[PDB]
Amino acid sequence: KVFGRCELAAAMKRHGLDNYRGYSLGNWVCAAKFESNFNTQATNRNTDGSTDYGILQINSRWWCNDGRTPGSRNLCNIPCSALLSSDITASVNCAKKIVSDGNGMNAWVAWRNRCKGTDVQAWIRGCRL
Ligand code: NA
């Protein structure tokens, strides 16, 4: 599923991401734009041979099982394929664990390089929330 910007903002807010660990809704929408272009089916191979899955490009090195990432963990206890669903529940639940790990949203390199310190409220502008 390719989410609309406000459509994804509504879904992330319903699932309790607005101001989760102090990160406003616009930070999460901005991360999703540059990670996945709001596409739940996005997959991208990392150089280390792990893969990133779904709207928030969650890595198989630590967070989900894809059966092809030697020496990896599955700390969200989910198949990585569950991170591609049109229903973002599994992605959001797993993102809450990631952002709680100690480095906040710096875990998402695209957030750090493209969203951090910017006017992220622009990403929820015009949305009925
Ligand atoms: Na894994």
The structural domains of the chain, with segments of one domain joined by +, span 1-129
Contact in structure between 95 and 84 (CB atoms under 8 Å) = no
Whole-angstrom Cα Rg for the chain: 14
Tokens of 20: 């989760």
H/E run at residue 40: none
Rounded CA gap, 108 and 104, in Å? 9
- Known binding residues for substrate are 101
DSSP H/E element including 30: helix 25-36
Residue 71 region, left (φ>0) first, then alpha (ψ -120 to 50), else beta? left
Q: Are 29 and 3 in contact (CB under 8 A)?
A: no
Q: What's the rounded Cα separation, in Å, for the pair 67 and 73?
A: 10
- How far is the centre of ligand 1, averaged over its atoms, from the C-alpha of 53 (Å)? 11
What CA–CA distance (Å, rounded) separates 56 from 32?
Answer: 5
Measured in residues, the chain has a length of 129
Name the method of structure determination.
Answer: X-ray
- Tell me the HSE value of 111 on the side-chain side, using a 13 A CA sphere: 21
Residue 52 DSSP symbol: E
The span from the first CA to the last CA of the chain, in angstroms, equals: 21
CA distance 54 to 83: 5
CATH architecture classification, 1-129:
Orthogonal Bundle (1.10)
85 C-alpha to ligand 1 centroid (Å): 18
Residues 6+ apart with CB under 8 A from 94: 56, 58, 63, 64, 76, 78, 83
* Contact between residue 58 and residue 94 where contact means Cβ atoms under 8 Å apart: yes
Tokens at 82, concatenated: 């569950």
- Round to whole Å and give the CA distance between 7 and 92: 15
Which residues are part of the catalytic machinery? 35, 52
Sign of CA dihedral 96, 97, 103, 106: negative
What amino acid occupies position 49? G
